[PDB]
Amino acid sequence: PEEAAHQKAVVETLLQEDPWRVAKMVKSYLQQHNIPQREVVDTTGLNQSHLSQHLNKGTPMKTQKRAALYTWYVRKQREVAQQFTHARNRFKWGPASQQILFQAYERQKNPSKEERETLVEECNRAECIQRGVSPSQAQGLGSNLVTEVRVYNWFANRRKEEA
Amino acid sequence: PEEAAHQKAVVETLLQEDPWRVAKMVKSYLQQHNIPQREVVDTTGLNQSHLSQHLNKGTPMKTQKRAALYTWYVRKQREVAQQFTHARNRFKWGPASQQILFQAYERQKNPSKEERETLVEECNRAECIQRGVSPSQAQGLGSNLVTEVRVYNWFANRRKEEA
DNA sequence: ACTGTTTACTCTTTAACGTAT
DNA sequence: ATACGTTAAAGAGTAAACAGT
C-alpha cells in the first residue's frame, strides 16, 4: 500500500491540470517508449477514437475516463524502469532508428549481415537514449528491441516501394 | 447472356493491359463515384490491404485475384448508370462538395436552414457533374445524396475542430 | 537467405449518434 | 433545433509471415 498511496495521489493532481497539457505529456511518453495505444485501450477500456482525439487534438473526455489513463500512466511508468533496471506487442520502429536506416539505405540498399549488425546497435543505442537509459540496458526495450531480422525485413520492404 | 458475353470480354481485355494503368482507372472510378473500397472487398472477398496497396501503390496481385475486381468493376459500372437512368453504405463527402462547404464556412459558420438547403443543391450538382450525369438525376447518388442534415452535422463537426 | 504474395495488426479520419438542453 | 460527448465504420500504413526458389 505504500507506493499505492503515492500513485493515487499523482492521479489526483493530474486530474486538476489542463487536459491538453497532461495529454501532450502522456503522448510524448507513448512516442518516446513507442508504446502502442492499443495497449492502453486493451488494459484501460476506453474507445480508441476517443483516446486518439484526446491525445492528438484535445477532445474533452470524462474525468472518470481520464482517471483510468492516469492510473495506467503511473503504473506503466513504474514498470518501464523495472524492466530496464534488469539487463505480445508488435515491434515499432523508432524515429531515431529510422534515421540511421534511411541513411544507410543511401550507401547500400542491400547490406551484409555484419553490415546490419552494426546498424542494429546504432539503432538500439539511439532508442536507449530516446527512453533516457544507458545503452547497456538494451533488452529492457522488450518487444521494441531491434534485431538483425527486423533490420532485414525493414530493408526488404523498402526495396518494394521502388517499383 | 447477351450482355454477359460482353462483360466477360471487358474482363479479359483489361486482364491483358498493365496492372497499374487499369488500377489507376478503378480508383478514379471509385473516387468519381465515392464508392467505398469496402464494397469491393465485401462483394469480391479480396483483402483490403492487398486491394488498397494495388490501387494506391503498384503492389501486384494474381490474375485470379485481379479478375474478381474486374467483374465487379464492369458490373457495377452498368449498375450505376442504370440507377441514374431510373431516376447499406455510409455517406462520403465529395471533393467538389467540400470545396463549396469550406468556402461558405468562411462566410458563415452557422448558416440558416435555408442557407444550408442552398448549399445542398450546389453540392449534389457538383457531385453529379463529377460523376458525369445531369443534376436532374440526383436521386441516383443513393447513400451519397447530400441532405440538409448531413450539411448540418458537417458544419457542426467542423466548428468542433476550432479550439 | 532473398523475392515476391499475402496478411494481421495499428492508427487516424470521419460521419453519425445519443444525450442532455 | 443544437452543443458536447461518444462511436461505428473506412482506409491507409506497417511489420511480419508464407511459399518457394
Numbering used by the authors:
A (entry chain A), B (entry chain B): 94 to 180, 201 to 276
Copy text verbatim from the article accompanying this structure deposition.
Hepatocyte nuclear factor 1A (HNF-1A) and HNF-4A are transcription factors that engage in crossregulatory gene transcription networks to maintain glucose-stimulated insulin secretion in pancreatic β cells. Variants in the HNF1A and HNF4A genes are associated with maturity-onset diabetes of the young (MODY). HNF-1A and HNF-4A form a crossregulatory loop, in which both factors regulate the respective other’s gene transcription. HNF-1A binds to the P2-HNF4A promoter and activates P2-driven gene transcription.
We therefore crystallized the protein-DNA complexes and determined their structures at 3.2 Å (P2 -169C>T) and 2.8 Å (P2 -181G>A, P2 -181G>T). Interestingly, the mutation sites in all 3 P2 variants were in proximity to the same residues, which were Asn266 and Lys273 in helix α8. Lys273A in the P2 WT structure forms a hydrogen bond with the guanine base S.4G. Similar observations were made in the P2 -181G>T variant structure. The substitution of a guanine with a thymine (S.5G>T) leads to an introduction of a hydrophobic methyl group, likely leading to unfavorable interactions with Lys273A. The strongest effects were observed for the P2 -181G>T variant, for which the kon rate was ~3 times lower and the koff rate ~3 times higher than for the P2 WT sequence. For both expression plasmids, we observed a statistically significant decrease in normalized HNF-1A transcriptional activity for the 3 P2 variants within the HNF-1A binding site (P2 -169C>T, P2 -181G>A, P2 -181G>T) compared with the P2 WT reporter, which was in accordance with our in vitro data.
